[PDB]
Design a protein around this ligand. Structure first.
Ligand SMILES: NC(=O)c1ccc[n+]([C@@H]2O[C@H](COP(=O)([O-])OP(=O)(O)OC[C@H]3O[C@@H](n4cnc5c(N)ncnc54)[C@H](O)[C@@H]3O)[C@@H](O)[C@H]2O)c1
Ligand SMILES: NC(=O)c1ccc[n+]([C@@H]2O[C@H](COP(=O)([O-])OP(=O)(O)OC[C@H]3O[C@@H](n4cnc5c(N)ncnc54)[C@H](O)[C@@H]3O)[C@@H](O)[C@H]2O)c1
Ligand SMILES: NC(=O)c1ccc[n+]([C@@H]2O[C@H](COP(=O)([O-])OP(=O)(O)OC[C@H]3O[C@@H](n4cnc5c(N)ncnc54)[C@H](O)[C@@H]3O)[C@@H](O)[C@H]2O)c1
Ligand SMILES: NC(=O)c1ccc[n+]([C@@H]2O[C@H](COP(=O)([O-])OP(=O)(O)OC[C@H]3O[C@@H](n4cnc5c(N)ncnc54)[C@H](O)[C@@H]3O)[C@@H](O)[C@H]2O)c1
Lengths: 322, 331, 317, 331
């Protein structure tokens, strides 16, 4: 006999069990590990799987997390370059790639392996350019559109609500405002929805968002766009904020909360867009994924920007093969 | 045609999805609502179902909880006397029945509460055949046996809250004695959740330091530390609280949430809960009492084999003999 | 030597975030359990005049200490047990009856915690918050009435039920007096910043297909309905008080619809307390959000302030 | 006026407000950020301050954390190379300095990190003279002694992260062997956080069941369970992780938040952290190593007296001689 046999008397019979809320993180770079630690911190999964092509670094990150198991509530942390380790995931976060032509080749291999072992999963795409790669993930996986989610402008909106909170001196959760469309240079700041305690700030300042504004809100939007670039210049990358926002998305889905997030969904047929492109809009997230999108009253220039972004994205998307 | 339809544009096709971690609390008395509020506070369920025979109270308790949904993370709270509201529960907490009057043994509640369980235990597994049943109603050890006979479920899915509360009271009294946190005080109250509970002095330790080695008189009448009085306080704790406020509820609610956390998060933590202990320490009958057990998503998968001293084994069999007498005469 | 001296070798107790709950009825214990569940304090004190029930409640909470992160739970009818509290939650009571209760409780609170923040929960909460402010001598930023905080939570729940989303994703403010005369600020009701009144301009009027005036009446009637069904309400208010305490003890500056002294706002000339969007942090209630309310909403605020002052003007000492 | 003045009407006068549970992290490398993200994720502080000599990276880490403020409960995140930004800290975590190269002993870093601490520690105490210092930089036991001598703080306010991490690793490996949660496993690694650490086999247990009483060969060479191998894996764990990913950070960040939680919440939980152990187990000089210690809002208030076997005392005193041998040659 062994010490396990002499100390522990089995009551329930032996079993190989399938986890209930397994999460897989593809890519253990700065972003992937930031997602992993935030996911573990919120006690969101009973099995965290890591996957990467760098076998040594992957094993090291896995061991480092396992050594903290005493302080967590995740009884199984696993990792391998073989995608069988991701089997039966509920949510798969894809952060792999360089930081379009190069990332599409990565996704052409990764996405089929994901749905081969987790056909019922939800896929959150984080790799840049995220709106284009969410389209690639949707096409390659064959999954319905409510199960392919691009992180999109969820982070851009968090940055905007932080800068707005700094102007007013209240908590970012008490400041409301949505950055929508394309994650990056061409995002759209819906000024009509910017409010505090239901007080529409554009009604107190109708020049909000224009070039003659005593409060300079166009500069705030510019700082949201330039935030990634400035932080990248200072520390080489960004990871902590995106990791926190991904865990926020996973919380809404795994707990089935039906909270509204500015994430990227397939917006063909909305606001006059005719191509299959992914853009960020207010979306309802729950245990089934992205089940609903909020219909908004967007001004002409806001719709014009969405149409322009959709044209720019599709112009890249149409030349991709297989 | 509806504000929902004007504002909410569908992306996924309309369906009805089963809950992932639904929990039912049967009986919304003092204990049932303390379990419910602790479960909700820890964000342990995506659907909470309540059942009671008092329709008006049951509805008001559902509504009160729903009014706090802004501060919670449970998107569905439902309640009805019909057990169809409990369908597809992962865990069913049973707190219905009568409680102790002032100075009344939990063993005096057997017959009244067995009759309650014969009505409700069949209706539970009818609508939740895949569920785990946590017995809270007293006497918990006997009612866990009764639940294990009436539902047909395997042993690993029928769990009595048992001495998880009793050990929590013991570790608190330990903690006050030594000046450290109760989580840093280790000790196990086992056997009956009642007057015949057994303090396992051989395992009472701080940071791996056996306190019985420091004081061999631990638990005897020639003890300068009077550890026997600490065990008496644990036994007397419920009677003292009932005399002061009429009942107990907050501590047991926290204890039940603690068990549910280990199972729904699949942690495999060890809790002293009441299980079928036949063939252990000389127990010859299907006696239910508390032993250190491993809880996870499957329920009660394992029991920890202990190396008890002779005085402790005798107290355990003495506790089991007390429990077997009432069990064997149950219709 | 003792076992504590044999086992514990010394190397080296003022609480950092002490909270007192006054009154251990249904509401007080609901506040206590929600405060403990969120690990908001290192020392919880309870005070009531029913000595035996107070002791039993204290012992019951202590027995669950293993599952909590609050190392000191104390209780006593004597207010010395409340010494040096950061926040005091007042839930005691059964107007004339409750004023005689507060004339006793409030001076004892400030005697033993002269720098505390007081949260008044007892009804009528707007009158009793004013009474607390006068008796305590505290600046108005340290006297907070729970006010319409719970009402706005009930409103957002009913919105969420109407739309199928989480209440935290529904936004709308119930302000003014906590009773039947609360104001629904329809112009702020929004989902994802989409103004629901601009989609339904008849929001709040009599001829409204979405019947928003009825949702406002359900907010008022729900308190009466729960009371008729289970005898009282407690779980929702306990969660809402714990949410307020979280904003202050974590210094978050989140906005809550709590009751503050609104003299000089919206034409109100008397010293009355009404619910407005207020910024709560470690200093207490440091700011109020300036809104541009409609005429009838301001008219209801001035009517409530008149009814409140009509009762307040005849209170002695 | 500005938008802030037209929208927000002051109820309270403006005031200089001192933070309530401010934490500073010195050194924003792999370990410092892992601590920060763990501190922020558990909502342990209302003000996080960051300090480093790399001004650009320091500001980038500050902005990156600030961009996640919507998902946090920390209203103030600040960063500067000037220690005035650390003022009024309750706890200061020092993770600055050089780390092990592949295959390098922690003790080989002592002279480089002592010179780093000679400038860091005085600046910390100038701006937070009433703080607790958690030393993380290696060799942590010696640098805790150095910190204690440079700070002038009482012993109960200078803490080395110590074997809190080695013990978590040991309890994890024990858990994988037994199939239960590490929190239900109990075992202590004491002494130096390094090659000469001591595994207290006499205190290893599960539910109070002494595992050395089930296997008296535990820790020796003729052991069927190969427990000496488990301790070897703990000692070698850092070198193996460094070989694979170049460093370690996630587990120590979780360990540091664990200590901070016990202290800021005043819990008096027991952790194996590095403290001044002169006069214990025959140790003659002011050396720091890990023993079970009670941590609360005052810091390290108490040490647990253990009944160590003669072999365990010898290994512990051997570890103290090794540390003191390096401690003598400091200037
Ligand atoms: N959505 C957002 O807002 C947001 C914010 C930050 C970063 N990002 C994006 O996330 C991505 C991750 O950035 P990072 O800082 O973690 O970079 P990183 O270099 O630290 O991580 C890249 C990882 O991808 C892995 N990888 C490379 N090729 C692979 C393949 N064929 N299969 C599997 N794995 C492979 C590498 O092993 C590496 O671990 C970047 O593309 C970045 O642009 C997005
Ligand atoms: N395990 C423990 O450590 C522990 C601690 C405290 C109490 N308890 C036990 O928990 C039980 C609950 O006590 P309480 O304080 O809530 O008493 P209570 O009277 O407040 O609650 C009893 C509730 O059960 C309901 N009920 C009765 N028969 C029912 C039936 N057939 N179906 C559905 N509901 C029914 C009643 O309507 C009532 O609401 C008692 O038996 C008590 O002894 C156990
Ligand atoms: N503002 C809100 O949203 C809201 C919601 C519910 C209830 N309430 C109010 O909260 C109060 C509490 O209601 P409850 O259901 O707990 O009532 P309850 O009868 O259950 O509790 C009242 C408690 O106050 C205590 N008490 C009486 N006089 C006292 C004194 N001088 N000092 C200390 N304690 C004293 C009593 O001992 C009793 O325990 C009620 O007055 C109710 O109107 C407010
Ligand atoms: N105690 C443990 O269990 C444990 C576990 C892991 C690492 N460590 C130790 O923690 C330390 C940090 O490791 P790391 O991987 O974060 O290193 P790193 O190289 O990633 O970061 C070190 C940081 O310290 C900063 N720094 C250096 N000198 C400084 C000074 N004089 N003032 C201010 N900042 C200064 C550097 O700019 C750098 O950002 C190492 O010494 C390592 O050995 C200890």
């Amino acid at each position: 006999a062994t010490l396990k046999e002499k100390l522990i008397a089995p009551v329930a019979e032996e079993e190989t069990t399938i986890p209930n809320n397994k999460i897989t993180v593809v890519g253990v770079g700065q972003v992937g590990m930031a997602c992993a630690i935030s996911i573990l911190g919120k006690s969101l999964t009973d099995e965290l799987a890591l996957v990467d092509v760098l076998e040594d670094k992957l094993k090291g990150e896995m061991m480092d997390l396992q050594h903290g198991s005493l302080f967590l509530q995740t009884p199984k942390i696993v990792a391998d370059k073989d995608y069988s380790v991701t089997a039966n995931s509920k949510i798969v976060v894809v952060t792999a790639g360089v930081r379009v032509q190069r990332n599409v080749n990565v996704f052409k291999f990764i996405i089929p392996q994901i749905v081969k072992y987790s056909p019922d999963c939800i896929i959150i795409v984080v790799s840049n350019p995220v709106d284009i790669l969410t389209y690639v993930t949707w096409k390659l996986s064959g999954l319905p559109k409510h199960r392919v989610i691009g992180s999109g402008c969820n982070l851009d909106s968090a940055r905007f609500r932080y800068l707005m909170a700094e102007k007013l001196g209240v908590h970012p959760s008490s400041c409301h405002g949505w950055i929508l469309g394309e994650h990056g240079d061409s995002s759209v700041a819906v000024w009509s929805g910017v409010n505090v305690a239901g007080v529409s700030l554009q009604e107190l300042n109708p020049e909000m968002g224009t070039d003659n504004d005593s409060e300079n809100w166009k500069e705030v939007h510019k700082m949201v766009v330039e935030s990634a670039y400035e932080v990248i210049k200072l520390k080489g990358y960004t990871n902590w904020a995106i990791g926190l926002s991904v865990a926020d998305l996973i919380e809404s889905m795994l707990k089935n909360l039906s909270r509204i997030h500015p994430v990227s969904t397939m917006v063909q047929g909305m606001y006059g867009i005719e191509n299959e492109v992914f853009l960020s809009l207010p979306c309802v997230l729950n245990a089934r994924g992205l089940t609903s999108v909020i219909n908004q009253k967007l001004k002409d220039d806001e719709v014009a920007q969405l149409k322009n972004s959709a044209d720019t994205l599709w112009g890249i998307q149409k030349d991709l093969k297989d």
